[PDB]
């Protein structure tokens, strides 16, 4: 569950310790930084080195056909960023349809839909937009339809 | 092109051969005639007691060959006449 | 010894004789027209009665027009029955490709000792499909794509399809209508129209064609037709092969000059020959298919050339139950000009791709473009700098395929049973092993003027690859997926190990 | 109520809900009309004449409506409609054979129409087909009989 | 569509002609 590690390169030597679920550790050189990760259903992803940032999230269930999942990630050169996804599934006696959407702050936003018909009809589309960035997407959409005889 | 394009052979009507046609005689019953020749393929839809036996063949890239046999019966089912036309006019 | 109640057919039975022979005799009499002979055995055969067919009816044709099935029979009503006159009908229906299964039956007419009912049963397949979709954004604008293709349109027997697209860089469309039956004897008639305006150099073209054809035998047919294509080119990038052609045509473009134009009006004559004895439309187990077509120019055209293409494949079963099958495929073609004229580059042959040779990128096999040293607004960081005065001072090599004047592709494919059998897969999914190879090369390549560059005239540089492929006639149409690993490649080649496409060809 | 409720109500009358949503394979659990199995939305939209399609479903429908007659007011007109639709099939088959030249099939096929549908328009329109078929041969008496029946009508 | 179908009417023969005998099927009784 824990122990030391070391590696060498062709005169440089780097050492550290891996110690434990939340796992942590550190690294130094003989040129330093920290890292950590966890696997619960939550997760942790932390990286810090002499660039920094961390990502964490968890899938939450709201209904038997819907969920909420935060996956925010920070990036340091501090650049604010976060991402939380949601979704819902649909079904019926002769069909099932899945719709998806999300928002990620930089801020990227997208939507889409996936419909499944009994035998010969398939339809879906996607749209992308963003806001508050140094660049932005005003409006873009892609869509396709198939019907078989 | 009219004489070039392939056409499948077309057969129509019942099969006839001289060996069997010569066996029919006036006085035979409908059962005897049908037995000797087989079931008629055409009859008079409007009530005349008569049977038609027509042998017609038209091979591809060939003319038409046929024989017409008309059989007439009385109200008792007894053959009354044999109309033999070995070829088309 | 042989005896029986035969109508004089003693010579035929003797020829047949000189344990299964009883059934060969049954087949002989079925050809003569005895539906139910009796053989006992020192064999005595009772020929029985002659039979006639009372009527022919179909079940399961919910979408197709009745005329579609009746025209494919050879046994006519009101005539003697023959086994050969029905079995060929059974095979004939399979070749249309409109059915999942074909069953046959013979029924007795109640109360009629010498008449039968001939009944065919089919299950119609879902074969056509229509698609459209869009793409839009403020960066590039909105693009459209749509089209429909069906082999059987509403069950009328007509083969039609409409396709086209419009976007910021090209305009393309085509329309095709073919009637497989124009006359009662099988004379076919069809044609197509298209438009192709590609703005990217500039490449604008359009044209139409009409094709006539008819059968000449049970397994053979002929086709012929006419067409016209307009071609107008401008601002083409100077190339060695391209300018050889231009010099042949009498053009003299300025040295490394991007400001240019060229247009031609070419009238052609179409012809072809086919053979088709396959026993199935989607997954065949026997027979072979040969498709030989070509075109020639006629007086009054700007170009003078001819082109012949051969496309053929053979299926041979290994297993008596047709579960193990070996498939051979080969494709050949050749073209040239007349009167000193070179063949135009827009008719050149290309090879490679999931359809023609697996594991290689589409149209990437063959001679590559060699570019001459100009200036543009893309020179700093966007253009092919060796094509300009600053990036290069001599002829620049590249991997840009230009196509050739000759090609040869062949492959061997080993078709096997699937990992498992299920109702949804038992007759819809098939897997096989294959070995693919082929080559494309040019002609009239003057290797004496360009020595430091590859010699494109040597056909021996054969490209080869192998892999595994999966076929599936899905509810959404034919799909084929495969993976292959190239073994022999040459500098400039490109590869794609995972490829798939629509299972049509 | 609404058909949307009928779909919701499927969680629990069933024949009506199946009919409203064209759940034709499920409406047969009652074993009155199966005519929906003889058509298609695409064929309808383009005005395609379905006379040449499979008539077996129409035959079953005819049998069941006869059983019900043996709503009646409308069922009788439906029986007339179906009978005429059936006659059209035989008519089309006769035309095909006339074009192909199997005159013997034409004669027997039309005679069948005469026995089975003596009151439909398809029969009156078919009558000229027998005269032609008889005139391909030397069977002049039948052509005369056909001409006489035509002149009377 | 079925309500627009043309009415049916029996055919009659000229004197001397006999019509085919009606088959035992597709018989529609007279109703109100």
Curated annotation (Swiss-Prot), chain A:
State where the protein is found: Cell outer membrane
Which superkingdom?
Bacteria
Membrane topology (UniProt): Multi-pass membrane protein
* Protein name in UniProt: Autotransporter protein EspP translocator
Whole sequence portion shown: 1038 to 1298 of 1300
